[PDB]
Amino acid sequence: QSACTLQSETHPPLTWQKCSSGGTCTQQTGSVVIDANWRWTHATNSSTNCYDGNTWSSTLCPDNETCAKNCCLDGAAYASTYGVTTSGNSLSIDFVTQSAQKNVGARLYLMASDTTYQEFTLLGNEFSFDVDVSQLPCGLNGALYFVSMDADGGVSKYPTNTAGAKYGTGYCDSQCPRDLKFINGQANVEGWEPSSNNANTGIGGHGSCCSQMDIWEANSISEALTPHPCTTVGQEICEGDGCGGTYSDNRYGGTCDPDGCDWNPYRLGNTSFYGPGSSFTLDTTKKLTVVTQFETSGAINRYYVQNGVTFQQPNAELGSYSGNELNDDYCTAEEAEFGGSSFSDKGGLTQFKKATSGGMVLVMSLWDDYYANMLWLDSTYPTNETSSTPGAVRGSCSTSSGVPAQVESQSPNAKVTFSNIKFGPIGSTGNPSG
């Protein structure tokens, strides 16, 4: 797609800290940009939509190439359309925003310049942020994560994409998402099927795969940390069901691991660690700090800080595994105890380290789940299981929770706030900000 300018594009500024081994931190100035899927897509020479509801224009978009030639992405009114605001080092995303139309959530990338994404090399480093999940009920996911996206949003590889990172192009993740309207500088109208339960979305013939570090997927009830490897590390197109991922026939039939090696303390047995109020170790009614450390072995370490008290990731015992480091032994024990082989089939933490060795883009989002109602995060899943099934219970939410239309109607003012991002060598991000 190209870019149009019927609507100006002004990326909300966002600062973050780059810390160094010598003990100091230096303020960085970036901005956030919304993913292309949320934008108005229209004809280059008029205001006629190329996409509306969950249908492509059959005249403007008879095939993927013609559609991309005929159509452009336009600018975003971040606050008034999308409920996205920033202030200094803080980013807030509202759940439902009513303007001329209804908007649900957002997916945002951290920029280096107004035309390029910020890349981070996670291996050897740590990432810290503060979050307020107090206004996230059952069924919602305020997510902070990394994906192996190109810094230019795909432009250098696909010159029919002239919109680029400035307009939030080039997304990929470990679900090999097929809901994307543009992939690799062409539309995704070929094979498009509207979603049965979402008036605004569908599934096309192409998807976009890459490695994904899910640092944080959470609401006020549950949280999870999940690396997802792929057989090809970086962004790559996939074809149809061959994509695998959540929305293909066989989620396991593609090049990415859609499940991951997940660590949810509640799922692992500690039902008192994270939740709303003073009966939990971490009180999700209050802001908390989350630190994630990528040691060079390929293992992942985690600690939390709230009100000046520090907690390592709680210990878990699972099969022959015991500890609090997300390592090969944990991931292996998890497959043995809970079931499945997706993570190991895609090459495990060894394959994952090939991603964290290179650059990844920071993503912050807020979403509800039109596939599984977020039950995999915060409830019992599958819903016919009981606590006697290892790993079935992931949080205290009812198995009836998280129906998108219901939570959108009941909790439209839900929101997440991410703030105080700090990045640098392991051991550095707790030092004084600059």
Ligand X SMILES: O=[N+]([O-])c1ccc(O[C@@H]2O[C@H](CO)[C@@H](O[C@@H]3O[C@H](CO)[C@H](O)[C@H](O)[C@H]3O)[C@H](O)[C@H]2O)cc1
Ligand Y SMILES: *[C@@H]1O[C@H](CO)[C@@H](O)[C@H](O)[C@H]1NC(C)=O
Ligand Z SMILES: OC[C@H]1O[C@@H](O[C@H]2[C@H](O)[C@@H](O)[C@H](O)O[C@@H]2CO)[C@H](O)[C@@H](O)[C@H]1O
Q: Which residues bind ligand Y (CB under 6 A)?
A: 269-270, 272-273, 281, 311, 314
Closer Cβ to ligand X, 18 or 286, answer by number: 18
Closer Cβ to ligand Z, 74 or 262, answer by number: 262
Q: Which stretch binds ligand Z (CB under 6 A): 110-118, 132-140, 255-263, 402-410?
A: 255-263
Site for ligand X contains 432 (CB under 6 A)? yes
Burial status of residue 341 (CB atoms within 10 A of its CB: 0-12, 13-18, 19 or more): exposed
Chain residues 23-42 in contact with ligand X, contact rule CB under 6 A = 24-26
Binding mask 251-290 for ligand X (x = CB under 6 A): ----------------------------------------
Site for ligand X contains 80 (CB under 6 A)? no
Site for ligand Z contains 342 (CB under 6 A)? no
The residue number with the shortest CB distance to ligand Y is: 314
Site for ligand X contains 84 (CB under 6 A)? no
The span from the CA of 107 to the CA of 162, in Å, is 20
Closer Cβ to ligand Z, 91 or 213, answer by number: 213
Phi, psi of 336 (to 5 degrees): -65, -40
Site for ligand Z contains 257 (CB under 6 A)? no
Site for ligand Z contains 372 (CB under 6 A)? yes
Provide the token pair at 135: 């206004």
Q: Pick one of ligand Z, Co ion, ligand X, none as the site partner of residue 226 (Cβ within 5 to 8 A by kind).
A: ligand Z
* Residue 431 beta carbon to ligand X: minimum distance, rounded to whole angstroms: 6
Among 105, 139, 154, 258, which residue sits at the site for ligand Z (rule: CB under 6 A)?
A: 258
Q: Pick one of ligand X, Co ion, ligand Z, none as the site partner of residue 334 (Cβ within 5 to 8 A by kind).
A: none
Binding mask 302-341 for ligand Z (x = CB under 6 A): ----------------------------------------
Closer Cβ to Co ion, 68 or 299, answer by number: 299
Residue with tokens 């009836």: 400
Site for ligand X contains 424 (CB under 6 A)? no
Closer Cβ to ligand Z, 17 or 226, answer by number: 226
* Residue 422 beta carbon to ligand X: minimum distance, rounded to whole angstroms: 11
CB atoms within 10 A of CB 400: 12
* Residue 260 beta carbon to ligand Z: minimum distance, rounded to whole angstroms: 5
Total interface residues for ligand X by CB under 6 A: 6
Chain residues 277-336 in contact with Co ion, contact rule CB under 5 A = 295, 299
Q: Pick one of Co ion, ligand X, ligand Y, none as the site partner of residue 338 (Cβ within 5 to 8 A by kind).
A: none
The residue number with the shortest CB distance to ligand X is: 434
Site for ligand X contains 427 (CB under 6 A)? no
Closer Cβ to Co ion, 295 or 385, answer by number: 295
Contact 143, 367 (CB under 8 A): yes
Determine the straight-line distance between the first and last CA of the chain, rounded to whole angstroms: 40
Q: Which stretch binds ligand Z (CB under 6 A): 6-14, 368-376, 395-403, 415-423?
A: 368-376
The span from the CA of 361 to the CA of 118, in Å, is 6
Which spans of this chain sit near ligand X (rule: CB under 6 A)?
24-26, 431-432, 434
Which spans of this chain sit near ligand Z (rule: CB under 6 A)?
175, 226, 246, 258-260, 262, 371-372, 376
Which spans of this chain sit near Co ion (rule: CB under 5 A)?
295, 299
